[PDB]
Amino acid sequence: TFFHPKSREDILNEEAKIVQALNNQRELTIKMHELKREEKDYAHSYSPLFSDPVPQGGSIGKAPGSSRE
């Protein structure tokens, strides 16, 4: 009569919630490992304002015919 253990159903449910939290942390770790080592933009990786990688060089003797696409 002194034995008052938590029932089997509630034990199973609590363990299941724990395992669900653990699998959620697993999937979050995988997602974060995948969002890292994913190619980012030039604005996010180098320069958010001057977002043009194309260099405009000197200006003192700028020859027409020097630009090229």
Binding site: E39, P53, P55, G57, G58, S59, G61, A63, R68
Partner: protein
Amino acid sequence: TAAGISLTGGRNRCFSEWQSFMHCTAKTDAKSRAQCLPNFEDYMECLHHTKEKARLREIESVLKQKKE
């Protein structure tokens, strides 16, 4: 920061090839970056003149042994 500036204050000798290559890099991603291989080859050729040197080696050798 001082990239693409000459000794005279303007565009350098191999600016245009570099600018073409950088246009093609801006177009592309790291998986499509291999499209910019001919542009980089052109830039390096303008820099170092390896292929033109080999070409002239062939021309000179034809002037060299096929005559004497």
